[PDB]
């Protein structure tokens, strides 16, 4: 069993679900990466394993070329192919590390979502899946991160035509928090 809920915001749809993000057939899936775009554990690890080795080579080519060796800055995004993933593209983003930059970190986390959704708009794609950014080894508390993710996504969908946005969570616990936070946020609209 895998729980799910949805809500329509104008002609967009927001869905939260339990599942494996690497099995999503949306146009885009989002990877919670590190600035170096090197393979790690967690969701990033699952994404590299499902994508195949062409994903790491593609990411390192982009780092050495369009980024000129620089780290992907916190909140910013890049896009690659999906390779062996069932999506067309992967948008890589870097979430804030909890309490590294206290008065900026809420804004930075929000930037991940905003910059990803803006890229979907530009490329004229119509479906995107997000995992829970920064709530792995980066330690952002899930209750706070969930509120920022949902507030930012709902805000964007209220103001733009995108299509379908999914938040795909491997954890039933993370799901349970998102469900109550989304329900809360919906009541306030
Ligand atoms: Cl700061």
Numbering used by the authors: -3 to 185
Direct quotes from the study:
Macrodomains are ubiquitous and evolutionarily conserved modules (approx. 130–190 residues) that recognize ADPr derivatives in their free form or linked to proteins, including ADPr, PAR, ADP-ribose-1″phosphate and O-acetyl-ADPr (OAADPr). To expand our knowledge concerning the field of macrodomains, we have characterized Oceanobacillus iheyensis macrodomain (OiMacroD), the first to be described from the order Bacillales. A yield of 40 mg of pure protein per litre of culture after a simple two-step purification process was obtained. Its phylogenetic analysis revealed that, among the six different classes previously described for macrodomains, OiMacroD is included in the MacroD-type clade, together with other previously characterized MacroD-like macrodomains, such as hMacroD1 and hMacroD2. The subunit has a mixed α/β fold, similar to that of other nucleotide-binding proteins, composed of a central seven-stranded mixed β-sheet (β1–β2–β7–β6–β3–β5–β4) and five α-helices.
Three crystal structures of monomeric OiMacroD wild-type (WT) complexed with MES, ADPr or ADP were obtained at 1.9, 1.77 and 1.75 Å resolution, respectively. The best WT and G37V crystals were grown in 0.2 M ammonium sulphate, 0.1 M MES pH 6.5 and 30% (w/v) PEGMME 5 K. D40A and N30A mutant crystals were grown in 0.2 M magnesium formate with 20% (w/v) PEG3350 or 20% (w/v) PEG1500 with 20% glycerol, respectively. Of note is the finding of a set of five well-ordered water molecules (W1–W5) fixed in the active centre of OiMacroD. The presence of these water molecules represents a constant, previously undescribed element in the macrodomain binding site of Bacteria, Archaea and Eukarya, even in the absence of ligands. A precise H-bond network for adenosine moiety binding was found in both the presence and absence of ligand, consisting of three fixed conserved water molecules (W1–W3).
